Design a protein around this ligand. Structure first.
Ligand SMILES: CCCCCCCCCCCCCCCCCC(=O)OC[C@H](COP(=O)([O-])OCC(O)COP(=O)([O-])OC[C@@H](COC(=O)CCCCCCCCCCCCCCCCC)OC(=O)CCCCCCCCCCCCCCCCC)OC(=O)CCCCCCCCCCCCCCCCC
Ligand SMILES: COC1=C(OC)C(=O)C(C/C=C(\C)CC/C=C(\C)CC/C=C(\C)CC/C=C(/C)CC/C=C(/C)CC/C=C(\C)CC/C=C(\C)CC/C=C(\C)CC/C=C(/C)CCC=C(C)C)=C(C)C1=O
Ligand SMILES: CCCCCCCCCCCCCCCCCC(=O)OC[C@H](COP(=O)([O-])OCC[N+](C)(C)C)OC(=O)CCCCCCCCCCCCCCCCC
Ligand SMILES: CCCCCCCCCCCCCCCCCC(=O)OC[C@H](COP(=O)([O-])OCC[N+](C)(C)C)OC(=O)CCCCCCCCCCCCCCCCC
Ligand SMILES: CCCCCCCCCCCCCCCCCC(=O)OC[C@H](COP(=O)([O-])OCC[N+](C)(C)C)OC(=O)CCCCCCCCCCCCCCCCC
Ligand SMILES: CCCCCCCCCCCCCCCCCC(=O)OC[C@H](COP(=O)([O-])OCC[N+](C)(C)C)OC(=O)CCCCCCCCCCCCCCCCC
Ligand SMILES: CCCCCCCCCCCCCCCCCC(=O)OC[C@H](COP(=O)(O)OCCN)OC(=O)CCCCCCCCCCCCCCCCC
Ligand SMILES: CCCCCCCCCCCCCCCCCC(=O)OC[C@H](COP(=O)(O)OCCN)OC(=O)CCCCCCCCCCCCCCCCC
Ligand SMILES: CCCCCCCCCCCCCCCCCC(=O)OC[C@H](COP(=O)(O)OCCN)OC(=O)CCCCCCCCCCCCCCCCC
Ligand code: SF4
Ligand code: SF4
Ligand code: SF4
Lengths: 178, 45, 115, 208, 318, 157
């Protein structure tokens, strides 16, 4: 079905009262006055402005922020150097090198994420089979040089150690959906 | 357990207005022309 | 004397403001800094080229109408005359002639812009 | 019935097959192949000489009325003699249908532009020339539309590298934005994401 | 003592201009469901000083194609004419008492238009040329209509002085006898001050910045000060002419307070209008002022020629 | 230290306060990141409340927020409007495209980061960074230019 947005049906003819109403509308600027009144109502409303940085906009546990590498509760790294995140990364922002550790464990020797190349899509955290790489909810990590956004394994493990109290709670609140 | 999912309430959601709703306000043209002419005459006197 | 003094004070104030605005901040100007602005690209042609005017007839009419304004402006002293009938008739004739000229130009589409 | 498989209607397939027979018998001088996909889409593969008559007939015929050109594009298959397959997707609002017209070209045989048939073909053929190097005859103004000014090569070709040949940087000695041969801090790592096992037996090509 | 009077006129007008910029930011924000500046200072009251200091410590632009002499001359001319237009206003006693006050106002306004034109031509840029030509068309339309409006109003008043306007509105506002030409005068002041919907010279969306698109820092600050001082000026002129404040011989402070309140209300109405309406097209502004305002203005001018004659209410010479 | 050193430090504080309280960006954007930039302009975050107001001409601009993919065809224009800004100017790269190419890093027609073209003061990461993150970058830039010691370095010369 369809409807007309501007087509008028029949005519209203001509009347002295209607002509006087249109004359008053043209001369006394009635629609302009009611536009003024609308802006006046908005003036006397309450603004929708939060007091940043003391107030923050609401988010969800699903929010994709700064990357981090998590651990098991024992303290062992969750990552097993399987390169699924590297394979699924649409921007090729992940570089992984690996070798057996001194105890024979399958661990990374290089895990780099170019955050200037990353598109913050969460494909790494949804392809990780052991929940090692995550996008924790940090978003206020802007730097002053281009280099500081080239994360390596030490930076990502430090982020995982810093944000574990929040990332674990978000994964607890979210993991039944995924 | 029971399947829990994001679903509408069993009674459905309430009616959502969507039509164009202008207040259709203001006084008549005769009345405001009469007010203006009366103001003119009083000011002239 | 007082009006001349306050005009000179305004002149001195604005000259002082523009002088401190030009001599206070650090200067660093080069060729790309002082090239003209054309939304990021080089200008195709100079801005001193002829630039067509679509309201030239309205501007000439504005000259004539401004002189009609100059004629109408001694009215607040003209209304003090003894022979108010002659003044009233002459003012009515002047305003009616001006209105007839405006109506004729509106009819002949002179107020409309070319192209 | 099956929740994971797309439902299939045979009426659209029958109608498109009938219309393909109709167009093929109307224009045997240019039509080389007519096919209907299992996705219920009609494709008519024509000789490059018949682009103007075929497009004009499809736009202006009473039973066709394909008055809207959806898009015009090219596909680079660099294993045939005529590597560029020019594709016209057209929409008939009168009959609520869509058709696809294909033709072929190589780097040195231009095809006729259809700006006189559809005006959108102007920018579409500009894009095709800019991205593939397929020249168009009788175009009102054929030039690049998406590449940089002075860009050399047609980047949507298969043999053109992904990163290109030049990169821009601001040189302070000349105070300009200059082009250099491309050097990458990290090379694009290509992946061999092809299973060595056949996935679709219906598309098994016979051995050579 | 006269120099002290010059100071106590000029400096408070400049501070009122800067806080007019602040109050425009606040009022536009609160009409746009936001807050506006409240960080820089207690309630944003240090924001204009921050902006002024930043602009006067940023380097100015001297483009290669630009005529330096007129480029320098135009903004200082604009600021001087703004303050000169401020000088003869009576509140209820003017600093400079003139006989042909509104003629001085008209001459100084047209010279401010020339400041805009010379800025646009000196800044050798196409957007500046566009701004200059739009200024030409705008001032053509509002000049003819506003001149006839002011002629009719002062024909009702009887003289070109403004203390005479105070004496005229001793008992009643001129809004009641002359409210249609009050509306047309308000629109004319909007077009004169280049406020939305009739700005059209600092065209933000149509042009980039228009006549001052090549101006930076200090001279741009001078242009902004001139424009907003003209806003307060034209609203003050409107409330002196049409909405007569209460004047008593024993105390003029009541007149100053009432004048301040009405001028603040009219300036806030200017900001309200800028929030409310979209911008005109500059040929439509000329068509409006020459096809709707001008015939009615000529008719009302004839009516105000006739009215004291047939009512015997010819105003006094003094 | 010397009494004049204290006066110079206070003058530096005053100049930095003025320049960080009045930051006017150029009305310049390229993509989705510029959509988030006008969502920062939106009533929730109120850059105007922070004192940050867009100006269309680069002559009246103080900072340049490179918000989007800087292409090869766009790079001379971006360099031109950066060069036409007056001297106390700053650059805020926004999003992965302007930072280091992002999703189009290996493209033939994309400059791999706007720092190859203009000197970037502050990098804001994200695709897109939220308006919260862009506002955070603006406040970080305000702190950075609060840290500037121009008159103190001039005195120590
Ligand atoms: C006020 C500020 C004045 C100085 C402005 C300035 O920076 O001048 C740069 C100047 C240095 O020249 P420059 O910047 O290297 O050359 C580029 C200028 O744009 C070159 O300047 P220009 O392109 O603006 O042209 C200057 C030109 C045009 O400028 C003027 O005429 C300006 C003065 C108007 C009065 O002036 C003259 O040719 C000499 C005029 C002498 C006075 C007029 C005498 C005859 C007429 C009498 C009635 C005048 C009304 O000093
Ligand atoms: C979807 O597709 C796309 C688009 O399409 C839709 C795009 O668009 C697009 C591009 C996107 C962008 C560029 C993003 C831009 C964002 C927006 C367009 C939205 C933001 C909205 C606006 C800009 C509208 C803002 C409206 C307002 C009302 C705000 C007010 C702004 C003003 C300019 C007016 C106020 C003025 C100022 C802030 C400056 C005023 C102050 C001064 C100049 C100070 C002067 C004072 C003095 C000098 C006084 C001095 C004298 C004294 C006496 C003082 C005493 C001093 C002492 C020290 C004592 C992209 C990429 C895109 O993909
Ligand atoms: C002046 C008004 C300023 C704004 C006042 C509040 C705005 C909201 C009012 C309510 C509303 O929306 O009304 C819409 C309504 C219009 O609603 P409408 O658009 O449905 O029209 C009603 C229907 N017809 C067409 C028949 C008239 O406004 C009115 O009814 C009155 C508008 C005209 C009168 C006011 C404007 C002309 C005034 C000229 C004389 C000057 C007065 C004194 C000024 C003193 C200060 C300088
Ligand atoms: C106060 C700012 C104005 C000023 O210093 O102007 C002087 C002008 C300014 O010219 P300037 O453009 O070189 O200023 C130096 C740079 N800033 C603006 C950062 C201070 O001249 C000089 O400072 C040197 C000229 C020769 C001085 C000879 C000795 C004089 C005693
Ligand atoms: C300073 C005092 C207060 C002033 C008003 C301040 C508050 C209101 C501000 C409102 C916002 C304005 C923003 C800018 C708006 C710009 C648009 C605009 O105004 O367009 C003008 C509009 C134009 O209308 P238009 O353009 O829509 O009309 C179409 C016209 N054609 C087709 C030709 C293009 O209206 C006017 O021009 C009218 C001007 C005022 C007329 C007043 C007449 C009063 C009655 C006179 C006497 C009648 C009886 C005679 C005797 C009979 C005896 C029997
Ligand atoms: C009335 C409204 C307008 C009010 C305007 C503001 C009034 C109050 C101003 C207070 C500050 C005064 C000095 C501002 C200097 C701004 C430029 C600046 O910092 O230049 C640094 C430069 C630093 O020079 P430099 O020697 O480090 O080297 C400059 C050249 N480079 C960087 C390329 C190597 O100049 C100065 O330090 C000059 C100081 C002048 C102090 C005058 C008092
Ligand atoms: C004595 C003469 C002077 C008197 C004082 C008033 C001066 C007025 C000066 C201008 C008058 C011009 C009138 C003729 C004219 O040019 O009309 C043009 C107008 C249509 O042109 P436009 O507005 O461009 O419309 C867009 C396209 N449809 O056409 C119209 O709008 C048609 C108007 C028809 C009605 C005319 C007025 C009738 C008045 C009756 C009063 C009864 C009491
Ligand atoms: C940047 C360059 C700027 C150049 C332009 C400057 C513009 C200045 C402001 C606009 C002036 C517009 C024209 C004003 C002319 C005088 C208006 C007037 O009516 O003056 C009359 C008045 C007294 O006359 P009356 O009202 O009859 O009173 C008699 C009884 N009380 O008063 C008088 O009789 C006093 C007569 C003198 C009044 C004008 C003084 C002007 C001073 C010179 C300014 C320019 C200086 C040269 C440039 C300097 C360097 C840039
Ligand atoms: C600027 C800075 C911020 C604002 C500063 C001033 C704030 C003033 C706040 C107090 C205003 C009080 C107005 C009356 C309130 C009481 C009331 O009864 O209001 C409702 C009444 C309309 O009720 P209703 O019965 O529908 O009326 C039909 C007949 N007109 O409403 C009315 O009759 C309204 C009459 C007044 C309309 C204008 C009010 C605002 C005036 C300043 C606007 C500034 C815009 C910028
Ligand atoms: S969020 Fe997406 S683009 Fe970023 S590292 Fe993970 S997979 Fe790569
Ligand atoms: S997908 Fe997980 S386990 Fe596999 S390499 Fe990446 S971070 Fe390590
Ligand atoms: S970084 Fe992402 S959101 Fe920003 S411009 Fe690039 S693609 Fe758009």
């Amino acid at each position: 079905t369809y409807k007309y947005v501007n087509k008028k049906e029949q005519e209203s003819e001509v009347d002295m009262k209607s002509a006087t109403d249109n004359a008053a509308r043209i001369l006394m600027w009635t629609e302009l006055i009611r536009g003024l009144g609308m802006t006046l109502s908005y003036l006397f409303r309450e603004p929708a402005t939060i007091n940043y940085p003391f107030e923050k906009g609401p988010l969800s546990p699903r929010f994709r922020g700064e990357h981090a590498l998590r651990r098991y509760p024992s303290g062992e790294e969750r990552c097993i150097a399987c390169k699924l995140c590297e394979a699924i990364c649409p921007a090729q922002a992940i570089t992984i090198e690996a070798e057996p550790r001194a105890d024979g464990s399958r661990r990374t020797t290089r895990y780099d994420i170019d955050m200037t190349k990353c598109i913050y899509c969460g494909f790494c955290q949804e392809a990780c089979p052991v929940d090692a790489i995550v996008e924790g909810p940090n978003f206020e990590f802007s730097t002053e040089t281009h280099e500081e956004l080239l994360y390596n394994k030490e930076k990502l493990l430090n982020n995982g150690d810093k944000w574990e109290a929040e990332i674990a709670a978000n994964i607890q609140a979210d993991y039944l959906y995924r | 357990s029971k399947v829990k999912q994001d679903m509408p309430p069993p009674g459905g959601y309430g009616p959502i207005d969507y039509k164009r709703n202008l207040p259709r306000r203001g006084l008549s043209g005769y009345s405001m022309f009469a007010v203006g002419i009366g103001a003119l005459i009083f000011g002239y006197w | 004397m007082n009006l001349y003094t306050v005009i000179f004070i305004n002149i001195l104030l604005s000259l002082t403001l523009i002088l401190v605005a030009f001599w206070l901040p650090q200067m660093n100007l080069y060729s790309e800094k002082a090239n003209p602005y054309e939304c990021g690209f080089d200008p195709t042609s100079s801005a001193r080229l002829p630039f067509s005017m679509k309201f030239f007839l309205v501007a000439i009419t504005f000259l004539l109408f401004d002189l009609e304004i100059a004629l109408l402006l001694p009215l607040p002293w003209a209304i003090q005359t003894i022979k108010t009938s002659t003044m009233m008739i002459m003012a009515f004739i002047l305003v009616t002639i001006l209105s007839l000229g405006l109506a004729y130009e509106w009819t002949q589409k002179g107020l409309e812009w070319t192209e | 019935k099956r929740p994971t498989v797309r439902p299939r209607s045979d009426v659209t397939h029958k109608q498109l097959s009938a219309f393909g027979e109709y167009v093929a018998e109307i224009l045997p001088k240019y039509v080389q192949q007519v096919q209907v996909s299992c996705l219920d889409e009609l494709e008519i593969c024509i000789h490059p000489d018949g682009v103007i008559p075929t497009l004009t007939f499809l736009r202006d015929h009473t039973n066709a009325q394909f008055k809207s050109l959806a898009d015009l594009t090219a596909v680079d298959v660099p294993t045939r003699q005529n590597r560029f397959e020019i594709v016209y997707n057209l929409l008939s609002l009168r009959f609520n249908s869509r058709i696809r017209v294909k033709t072929y070209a190589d780097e040195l045989t231009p095809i006729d532009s259809i700006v006189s048939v559809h005006i959108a073909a102007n920018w579409y053929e500009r894009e095709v020339w800019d991205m593939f190097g397929v020249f168009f005859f009788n175009h009102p103004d054929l030039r690049r539309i998406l590449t940089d000014y002075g860009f050399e090569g047609h980047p949507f070709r298969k043999d053109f590298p992904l990163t290109g040949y030049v990169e821009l940087r601001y040189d302070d000695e000349v105070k300009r934005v200059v082009a250099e041969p491309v050097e990458l801090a990290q090379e694009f790592r290509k992946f061999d994401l092809n299973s060595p096992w056949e996935a679709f037996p219906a598309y098994r090509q016979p051995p050579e | 003592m006269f120099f002290i009077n010059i100071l106590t006129l000029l400096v408070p007008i400049l501070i009122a201009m800067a806080f007019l910029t602040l109050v425009e930011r606040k009022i536009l924000g609160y009409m746009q469901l936001r807050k506006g500046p409240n960080i820089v200072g207690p309630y944003g009251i240090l924001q204009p000083f921050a902006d002024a200091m930043k602009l006067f410590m940023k380097e100015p632009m001297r483009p290669l194609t630009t005529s330096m002499s007129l480029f320098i001359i135009a903004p200082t001319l604009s600021l001087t004419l703004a303050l000169s237009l401020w000088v003869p206003l009576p509140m209820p006693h003017p600093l400079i008492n003139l006989n042909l006050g509104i003629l001085f106002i008209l001459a100084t306004s047209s010279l401010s238009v020339y400041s805009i034109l010379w800025s646009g031509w000196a800044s050798n840029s196409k957007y500046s040329l566009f701004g200059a030509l739009r200024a030409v068309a705008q001032t053509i339309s509002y000049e003819v209509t506003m001149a006839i409006i002011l002629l009719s109003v002062l024909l009702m008043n009887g003289s070109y002085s403004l203390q005479t306007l105070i004496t005229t509105q001793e008992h009643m506002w001129l809004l009641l006898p002359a409210w249609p030409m009050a509306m047309m005068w308000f629109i004319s002041t909007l077009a004169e001050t280049n406020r939305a919907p009739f700005d059209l010279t600092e065209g933000e969306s149509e042009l980039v910045s228009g006549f001052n698109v090549e101006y930076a820092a200090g001279p741009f600050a001078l242009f902004f000060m001139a424009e907003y001082t003209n806003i307060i000026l034209m609203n003050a002129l409107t409330t002196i002419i049409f909405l007569g404040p209460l004047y008593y011989i024993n105390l003029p402070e009541l007149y100053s307070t009432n004048f301040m309140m009405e001028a603040l209300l009219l300036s806030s109405t200017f900001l309200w209008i800028r929030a409310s309406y979209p911008r005109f097209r500059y040929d439509q502004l000329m068509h409006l002022l020459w096809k709707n305002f001008l015939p009615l203005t000529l008719a009302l001018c004839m009516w105000h020629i006739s009215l004291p004659i047939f009512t015997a209410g010819v105003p006094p010479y003094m | 230290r010397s009494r004049a050193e204290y006066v110079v430090t206070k003058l530096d504080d005053l100049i930095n306060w003025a320049r960080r309280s009045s930051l006017w960006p150029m009305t310049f954007g390229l993509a989705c990141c510029a959509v988030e930039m006008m969502h920062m302009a939106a009533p929730r975050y109120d850059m105007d409340r922070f004192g940050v107001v867009f100006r269309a001409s680069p002559r009246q601009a103080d900072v340049m927020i490179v918000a989007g993919t800087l292409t090869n065809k766009m790079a001379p224009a971006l360099r031109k409007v950066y060069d036409q800004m007056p001297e106390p100017r700053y650059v805020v790269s926004m999003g992965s495209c302007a930072n280091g190419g992002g999703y189009y890093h290996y493209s033939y027609s994309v400059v791999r980061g706007c720092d190859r073209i203009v000197p970037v003061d502050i990098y804001v990461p994200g695709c897109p960074p939220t308006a919260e993150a862009l506002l955070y970058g603006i406040l970080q830039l305000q702190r950075k230019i609060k840290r500037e010691q121009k008159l103190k370095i001039w005195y120590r010369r």
